[PDB]
Amino acid sequence: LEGASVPVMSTSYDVVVDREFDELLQGKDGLLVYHKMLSDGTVKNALNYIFGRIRSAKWYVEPASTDPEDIAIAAFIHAQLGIDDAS
Amino acid sequence: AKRALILLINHGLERFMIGVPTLTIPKSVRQGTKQWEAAKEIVKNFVQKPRHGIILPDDWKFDTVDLKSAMPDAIPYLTYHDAGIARALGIDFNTVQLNMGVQAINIGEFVS
């Protein structure tokens, strides 16, 4: 039985370097652009909706099986997170 | 933007509502004369006392500045910025128009 023969490789070709072609958005200079966009009212309106809806999705823990031991381990994790009706 | 637009609209509304008076007089008329006071009184009264009326010799010409178009309607751009204040806090109904104007049937969904 053999492990992986193919390594994980970068998404790079020609001007595309690690998924990005535009120099102004490469690396940490890129992060400064995204940070400045948080000051835009339309960006903030969208994130308020998206992030609100994500948290409201009625989060719960499903066990690996209906076996009592798998239920027991699932209950431990439920208790760790404090799963409740309002998330 | 809202504060800067209210200042600009206030100023525009006065020039389109009242008009900017111009009085063209003969070159002989000199400042600090009877004729000069009469010129200042005409321009002042146009603004302050419109019912007063204007009597001119035939070598004096009164007019308002021709702005050459209607005043632009800046209300939609002002309400874009004003309602935008509430949008930036994550409110998803218009807090400036509220119930007024043609709208979506289902206001309840935007409150949700």
Swiss-Prot record, chain B:
Ranges that cross the membrane: none
Keywords for this protein: Capsid protein, Viral capsid assembly, Viral genome packaging, Viral release from host cell, Virion
Coiled coil: none
Gene Ontology CC entries for this record: viral capsid
Localization in the cell: Virion
Record has Methyltransferase as a keyword: no
Protein function: Forms the portal vertex of the capsid. This portal plays critical roles in head assembly, genome packaging, neck/tail attachment, and genome ejection. The portal protein multimerizes as a single ring-shaped homododecamer arranged around a central channel. Forms the portal vertex of the capsid. This portal plays critical roles in head assembly, genome packaging, neck/tail attachment, and genome ejection.
Family to which this protein belongs: Belongs to the P23virus portal protein family.
Quaternary assembly: Homododecamer. Interacts with the capsid protein. Interacts with the terminase large subunit; this interaction allows the packaging of viral DNA.
Name of the protein this chain belongs to: Portal protein
Range of the intact protein held here: 224 to 335 of 448
